[PDB]
């Protein structure tokens, strides 16, 4: 529908992967209807985080929240040239909810500093 080409490099390192109409309530129609609703729900579910973090229309957006070393103690050579995006998630999956809240407020405080900056 979109693409599973992102998934091509699921075993590659993090540095390599990153670099008709009419509705009929038949058993297949109800099946194919929820698939259409379940797609736009899961799509906007991710797309509203990108918007609220100030990253809509971006694939790679840099933030302003420093990397708290308690989230991971590994080196940049141990991450981007060793771990895969699939296993790196399992190591950091505890702090993902703790990180998503910091990127959410780093964008919020950046917005009020701009409304004071452009007022000159």
């Amino acid at each position: 529908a979109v693409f599973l080409g992102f998934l091509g490099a699921a075993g590659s390192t993090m540095g390599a992967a990153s670099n008709q109409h009419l509705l009929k309530l038949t058993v297949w129609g109800i099946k194919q209807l929820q698939a259409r609703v379940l797609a736009v729900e899961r799509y906007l579910e991710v797309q509203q985080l990108l918007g609220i973090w100030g990253c809509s229309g971006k694939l790679i957006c840099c933030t302003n929240v420093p990397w708290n070393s308690s989230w991971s103690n590994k080196s940049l050579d141990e991450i981007w040239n060793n771990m895969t995006w699939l296993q790196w998630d399992k190591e950091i999956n505890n702090y993902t909810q703790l990180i998503y809240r910091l990127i959410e407020e780093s964008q919020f405080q950046q917005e009020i500093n701009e409304v004071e900056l452009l007022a000159l």
Epitope: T13, G15, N81
Partner: nanobody, 128 residues
């Protein structure tokens, strides 16, 4: 983690062609190079060569260019990131100069400048 248990400390006589095994545990066997380095009793530590358990590519030392046969059988998957492979290595016209402890070590990373660097060493097999 990971452990690269080696073969047995078997000693033959000059002219033989002993094989040394090196089976791994606790890590993806295909994701890292295997490396063999000996420590001759009358020489400095000598690097012999590495092979890629994934690509199947070899690169050895000039002093072992036509004297060493090293191979690897495929890995037996255990989980999404653990495998159980094995690494074998032979010598051709073996003499008494090849006497010493032999080591097998796995690569440092799987990308970058120091990809194959012998990071995790095994246990050692004493020869003739």
């Amino acid at each position: 983690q990971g452990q690269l248990v080696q073969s047995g400390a078997t000693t033959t006589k000059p002219g033989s062609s002993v094989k040394i095994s090196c089976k791994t545990s606790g890590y993806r066997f295909n994701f890292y190079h295997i490396n063999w380095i000996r420590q001759t009793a009358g020489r400095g530590p000598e690097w012999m060569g590495w092979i890629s358990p994934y690509s199947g590519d070899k690169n050895l030392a000039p002093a072992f260019q036509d004297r060493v046969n090293m191979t690897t059988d495929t890995e037996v998957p255990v989980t999404s990131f653990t495998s159980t492979g094995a690494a074998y290595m032979e010598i051709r016209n073996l003499t008494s100069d090849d006497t010493g402890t032999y080591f097998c070590a796995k690569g440092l990373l799987r990308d970058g400048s120091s990809t194959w660097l012998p990071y995790l060493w095994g246990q050692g097999t004493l020869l003739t």
